[PDB]
Amino acid sequence: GSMIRCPKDKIYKFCGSPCPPSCKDLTPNCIAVCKKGCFCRDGTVDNNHGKCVKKENC
Structure with a gap:
């Protein structure tokens, strides 16, 4: 806890x-707008499951 660290x-x-x-x-x-936090890597697409996969994998 305390320190915010995402996957x-x-x-x-x-x-x-x-x-x-x-x-x-x-x-x-x-x-x-500049929002801060944890984001997916470039070249990945966010799916409706709450995870990002490779663009060509979707």
């Missing part, structure tokens, strides 16, 4: 897109 399969960002590429929407339109 090693993901990375941490201070400014990231609130709308990452996904199987639901490959390119969602939203205002560019």
Whole structure:
């Protein structure tokens, strides 16, 4: 506890897109705002299960 550390399969960002590429929407339109936290790696798509897989795997 105390220290926030997400799964090693993901990375941490201070400014990231609130709308990452996904199987639901490959390119969602939203205002560019810097949100901090843990995000998926570049080249992966977020699926409706709550995990990110490779773009060509979806």
